[PDB]
Design a protein around this ligand. Sequence first.
Ligand SMILES: [Cl-]
Ligand SMILES: [Cl-]
Lengths: 294, 295
Amino acid sequence: LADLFPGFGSEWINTSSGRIFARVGGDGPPLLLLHGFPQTHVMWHRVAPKLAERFKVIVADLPGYGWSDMPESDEQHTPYTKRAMAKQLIEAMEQLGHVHFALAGHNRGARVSYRLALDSPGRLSKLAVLDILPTYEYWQRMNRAYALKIYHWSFLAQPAPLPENLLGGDPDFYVKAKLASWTRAGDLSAFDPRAVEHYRIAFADPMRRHVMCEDYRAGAYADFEHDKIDVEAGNKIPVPMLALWGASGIAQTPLDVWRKWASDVQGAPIESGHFLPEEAPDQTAEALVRFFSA
Amino acid sequence: LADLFPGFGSEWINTSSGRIFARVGGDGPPLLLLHGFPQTHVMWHRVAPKLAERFKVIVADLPGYGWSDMPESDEQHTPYTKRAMAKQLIEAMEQLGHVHFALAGHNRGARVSYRLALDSPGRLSKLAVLDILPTYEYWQRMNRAYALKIYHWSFLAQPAPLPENLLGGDPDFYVKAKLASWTRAGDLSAFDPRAVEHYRIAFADPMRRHVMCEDYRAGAYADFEHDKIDVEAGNKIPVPMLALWGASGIAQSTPLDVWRKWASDVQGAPIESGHFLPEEAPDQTAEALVRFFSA
Ligand SMILES: [Cl-]
Ligand SMILES: [Cl-]
């Protein structure tokens, strides 16, 4: 497995729910970066160097992903709810002495991030979400066209062991297909092969795939209910917020949606499929540096 | 594999789209029975003998299923659209000299059957549809709860080879899990094990699994579009119709209110059953069908 973060340390951070793995580089204000599915912290390898020019950058594997430990789940998928993942990452950041930090997330990691901002806004100075809308919004939009396009939100959420059993046949194929299908190119050519190997290696482990399905089960049930309470309450994120999205990505009218969720948000499309930090590393890094800079 | 229709003949019927396998029994007015997914013609084995006391019963494998031939598909999934399957079975029935016949279908077979009534109502004296709503109505009701409750329509319709590769690893597990999941009790106790083996052996062939995925791709795309044209035009089936559904089945998540939108002469009833009415509730299903087709 390649080292894709020149000048970054490797840290195992303890929490009450298990260790969080992170690459840590740079100096200055702290900035936490959170990946999603089906990836690991290494998806930030093209933009983290640029960020570490100006920030102390912490590139964390989500609870249960990558090299982070896997807490035992329960019937309500609790540890892989975004509320719980956010609480676990707040604890990890406390181990480093960071109780007020900047945060950028992509895919599942952006769901942890906006949930963190709703539950504990005092933890965050600024928030960036990459190519997502809130979980509640994607479910409200779940008509035929969306059921077909984001089928995996329902498939991966089927009761165990249905998706686990199917994924075990040829996991390499499924993970590479998801990576390719959500890019603009439709193939794997936007990715560093060394990074694809990190993603394949993780996805090859049945325990890791089981966590992924628990994460989508949470996304269909408790995460949805948590979001629904905030919508019913008219709660809005007060943290200054940036929403970036792919011109051919999944979130796509994104700024109009996030404005119903957040009182201070700017945004922009980037010509890219879903995987902004890998398909469009220079534009994503520039937008993030400019946003997070005081 | 067992013979579950002791006494019935076997026919391999040529059509322009490939052979249709059927078991043939009884005597009297002609009655075509059409299975669905993930089954074959054998799912009628507990009701066909009773029907054969009153009708000439033709128990056919759908195009691409069981022992019927598998036409090569295309970008629009054409041979596995219900419009094409209906045309093919109309050709098959004409090979037997049946140009006007009674029809009962279940699951995909029921979708072939109502599409056949919308496209070619003159071919049918009466029609029964077992535990389905129109494909348009399934998709229209799509929302979070339905997406999570009935996921396979969107999953099996994903572009090839995604579902085919996922189903390849352990096909027995998937087909047995679907058969059990849609019954009242959630297990295989409703099925004759010999019938389950028929289903399992069909599902074990990658070519048969690809046909099934093409059928669901049709169901998400051209079948839905064909339905949408009829409903937006206000077209109703004129053929006298029976909608029979399971109280715990897939369609009920009443069907009769839905079907009255699609058909001008429809009656219907629930049966205490999951989806698989002819195996879960064979005597009630056979009675309901004999009474409807005889009346
Ligand atoms: Cl996501
Ligand atoms: Cl239905």
